[model samples]
Target: DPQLLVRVRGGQLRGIRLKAPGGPVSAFLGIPFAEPPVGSRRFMPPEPKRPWSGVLDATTFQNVCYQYVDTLYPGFEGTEMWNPNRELSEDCLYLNVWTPYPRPASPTPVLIWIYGGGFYSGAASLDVYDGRFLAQVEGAVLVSMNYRVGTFGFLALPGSREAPGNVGLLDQRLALQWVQENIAAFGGDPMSVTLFGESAGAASVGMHILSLPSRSLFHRAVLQSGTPNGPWATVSAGEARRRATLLARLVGCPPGGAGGNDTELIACLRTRPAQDLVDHEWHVLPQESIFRFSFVPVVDGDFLSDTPEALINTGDFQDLQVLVGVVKDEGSYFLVYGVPGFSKDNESLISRAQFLAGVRIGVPQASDLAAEAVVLHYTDWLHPEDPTHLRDAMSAVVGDHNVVCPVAQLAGRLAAQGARVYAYIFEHRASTLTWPLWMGVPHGYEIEFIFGLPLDPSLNYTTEERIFAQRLMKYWTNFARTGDPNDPRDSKSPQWPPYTTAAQQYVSLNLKPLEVRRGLRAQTCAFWNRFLPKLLSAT
Candidate 1:
């Protein structure tokens, strides 16, 4: 009881229980930045919470937003994810806050995290994502929360003006708004907010950075393994409507002529079945990126004036600092399914190699060498059972294609415009983590490290890991406090060079961090970059 501390405070909702450290701490948890966004208001923009009359007890966590994770994911069996104690309802807009100290004048830097799951699933309440250690150890105000996922967040239909594309992005923006106006009350510097995320969450952060609504949201940002220049963001509104209409029908909405109005559609959906709507055929991850599943952000030409890369090159984003990178093996999600650290056979690997090449580079243009190149590079380390020399090559290509390239393009564009950018990579695979069936750090495994959970014993601590974490915390928290990641006091820390368009600078993080020239990994990254443009061009 002494170790866990909680207090009550007036929040955007009816009552919110705030968790924090007693005397000294690194972060706080579960402070509601806004009210639940449910009701007839589902899919619409978030409304500010009606002020509560009394100090709400902020001891317990608010129910997480409604969303679904596949049954196959690690640790998903019989978990609340399959049949959550709380109903899967749309009124899921809420936030979790972490802080070093709950008292004012603590002057801690504040960091807000966004979870990644296509545009469909993920929440802020996961035990692995708890910010207790981040708050208690890093000495910063770490905040995380839930936004509407799946249909509640991305149901864009023909003139589905009821909720425009990217409502989830809007929810993210509003949370930042809360931090700007209220974080200081909880011992955070409102001016030092950092918006960060991995995958779609990182993409969303990039989207927010380019939005007019989020102009004053934060001073700096950290993007891991993603960008907003994907298929969903570039789709036309008309195409979005077509997709939404099909999804609505598949989800058990009224037959074609029955109810077409936005209100009627939403009303019908409110009472229509939740499973059918939530169980649409489309798989979100790769499909959402390719526009085959879940609805994602659009070029509404307003919220997003242009793609993040274009905006950066054209000078659309405000002069804010950015830190971006991807993992060493970001592409293994396609393999290793159904078995631990298992992988497809060499032939299957070759077929997949050619298939991906054809998909990204061009149809029938991939030579055997291009296909074999992947095997030659990654075969060494692709499988833990028989690590090979090609692992670095494989990881490099996969990293660049999925994570590295997109972010690098943005970095190049940003640097061209003279904005400050610090690029780096996250490569420490959790020594004790049960590597996902289809991947290593498949996606979001980093949340555990961020939350200070231990990789071994599935527990949480280690002297060395904690030390590394503190150094990471210092880099990130200092960035949040100011625009710089290295200690502002000019203390002795390794040098972090800015990204250059030609020989851009980048940091490689492993057991320890090292620097690599931008073009240094070109041979490895080319497999993805050389061909991705072609696949993306087909759309």
Candidate 2:
């Protein structure tokens, strides 16, 4: 079994062969996609790595990008648990590949994954993102890549080659370029690649879809629980500069101008240890919004010409096969794991009122009336003064604002413009996981079912669970292959019609009776699409 050679950029690499439920699997882990973004390369777009002279061993994971470790939440393990706690470093522009078959003459459909940790943190080596199961079972090549995060990746200053924003996104785009150039060595079709991700990663997929530079990278998409319209997804140039200035000052560097110019400030800040910047960069969050990530993609005129919403509205986004959806309670993860002040029993009228006001912190020029309308609709309080339902109500609004409504808005807009759109709502619950009942299908829970990960010891899954996973792999991989989820091979999965204004249909990714739902979150989406735009326009 010595036939695991792959010749690509830099050098020839050796991968490992393994077996899985569906068939044979081959894995090549931690292959460099770009030169290490360290030293002078910090805050710059990725550069292609120099060609190596020898065979590269790509069997083990490289270091992960620097991230704040959230060790444990109340009922669930933190990001660290899923992510391998290997060494952390700035030289983390690497990717992993899994293929079910040998390097065939005909290319296999590819699925490139982007993991989500808001925007501040995530890595490709997470256990949940392992590509073996998807590759072997679906007869496709699967890929995941690492990019810079937080201040190192996203910090923006006045325009210069040095301090441009969207470096994280540039990292992603560069990875896609690498895939296009080299994935064929691993038996993947660059033309048939599908860009898929969750939360911030989903938003990244959407941004790449919007950006001119990234338009040629992929032919399909799957956005799980995120869209570019999420309040925190993109920042204005002014806001980004403000955050950059504040970050520089907070980190004890000279502010721009007389003391030190943009270049000087950037150099000084880059001199700080990765952990120091990771520690202080989070302070850029406005005090009111508890679950916010301060540093994110900004409209950088070149890579991103305008906000994603503005660009998409102007008919500037790529029309590709798309599958997008959200879990029943996508917001609960933030309330439970993100906000330390928020918990089930501790919410009071005063605290809840402040928390409600905090929701407006993310939106630009959001009105008190708009916030009031939101709170009023979400809460059915037995006693208005008691605020007993505050936590649940806030969670609902969070899901609507950040995950559900934005996805719906994007879907409708795409379909209205004749792009192939397939939308969904995930409502499945594990019988043994009490967290689901408490938080309503907590954010990223759908990953468990998608990967068929044997994570929960509490629940012994029945045949129903296996069937759901199998069908989903079919839908997702089929969509990757042919840009259509309805496989002619499997009628049991039902006809997933391309979403259009005429039918406005969506598939429900849940339990046994897998039905196609029409007019998903119609009422809620109507309010958000109608009112939110007005509020944003007024601002």
Candidate 3:
């Protein structure tokens, strides 16, 4: 039945009703969160879209924010699914919600999901992000939003009203505001909103956790595989402008040449197709950097006031209920194609040296001595000539440097501040999946289980995988209800404890009886946190 109607901030919307495995559900897809960033509104902060005249039909998904379609993925190894059929456009400030009942008597808890594609790519309507499963199983209203990405969302040019960095982040904040204002109509408790995300999306959650404007917007947060403390989470405003200027030149608009005034240059840029901007050269950092992307967040004195590391260390972050964790081998996503130093044909010394260079690129604050020390410390197998040794070593170091260590450090800091911090280490592997075994619980394995998503039917799951997924959904939704994941209300789940410096406890999520473990990646996290900071201070 497609006759469900609900009132929102802007106007009335009609959604479609369907039945889920758990129960019946109402899906309101493609509702506008903010006015489209089109025409003169491009690159500026999002404005609340004006009210609509009548009931807006929200049965269909709006055009996805323009992004490159994944032709290679759903590849042999079978990673996250991406859809190319979704129409693409700039008019993409849309959000979706799934509720168990239309206009319930009491407002239910709301879960706001921010998708992750390294900040350059993603869409809320992706198969992995569908909210019906979570809504039906968890009994909470689920929402996902589409925000600007790449040049359209993040480019910072001379710091003008016409364009500024962190607009993408601003887009996120506005969506949260939309939820606060209108989720009640969908039977959702606005005050109980929990922001959770994966990879870059997780970093966005962490950013909101730190941001003054957005800190109060959400009551709780769950960060998976990313943290704001990562070196690449933000770049300086000057660096952003420099990159934008270079991009303009690459797209045939040289400064002071034809589009003489800065405004004119921006106007010319606006005139070009959106894909033209996305196709142009954009690098996250310098060429010598380990990880480089087209666009990321920038410190503009407002949204992201300062470096997250500096801010976090000084205890200048929002006090909120936090759940943070990382996968066993977070580096597989970084080296999706193949490991550089692990090939038998490659020169061992050259590979070792290149890997060392990547270490410095990953953490520039560490001195030459500290960087060398890391290479030596991570080299446990002692045989650099062996490909297996090189492979595991590379995976361990990169995974720790990028995801594991930073998140653990964040949990520690939050725990020290007396904030409720629950930490986990995801080591669960599916029965039929060959990729995760080789990759070692690669980046998004946890999400697959958490949502019980639609994957290749040909690949069957073991009883272990099925049981783990069931337990995980309970734990995650339990956290959404009350702040603690180990509430006595949930009988089947284990007694998950809070992370603290004294115990250093963490839930080891796996088929191995779903047990709790202490001291996860202690050596690696200690090396990165204790030794690396001292090394950086000296430099």
Candidate 2 regions exceeding 4 Å error are 71-84, 101-105, 255-260, 316-319, 337-341, 344-365, 381-389, 431-436, 454-460, 536-539
Instruction: For candidate 3, list the clashing residue pairs, or say none.
Output: none
lDDT of 1 by residue, 424-465 (tens): 776677655555432455445555565566523335456566
lDDT of 2 by residue, 263-347 (tens): 8888887787888788887788655554467888888777777778776676533467799888888777666544434654443
Off by over 4 Å in 3: 1-3, 70-80, 83-85, 255-261, 288-290, 316-319, 337-370, 432-436, 454-460, 490-493, 533-539
**lDDT (CA) for every model shown?**
0.61, 0.76, 0.75
Give the TM-scores of the predictions, in the order they appear.
0.80, 0.92, 0.90
Question: Which lDDT tens digits does candidate 3 get at residues 304-384?
Answer: 777887767766433578888888788755554433343222333235655665566555556788878887887654575
Which 10-residue window in model 1 sums to the lowest lDDT? 283-292
RMSD of each: 5.4, 3.0, 3.3
Evaluate candidate 1 by giving its C-alpha RMSD to the native, one decimal.
Answer: 5.4
Best by lDDT: 2
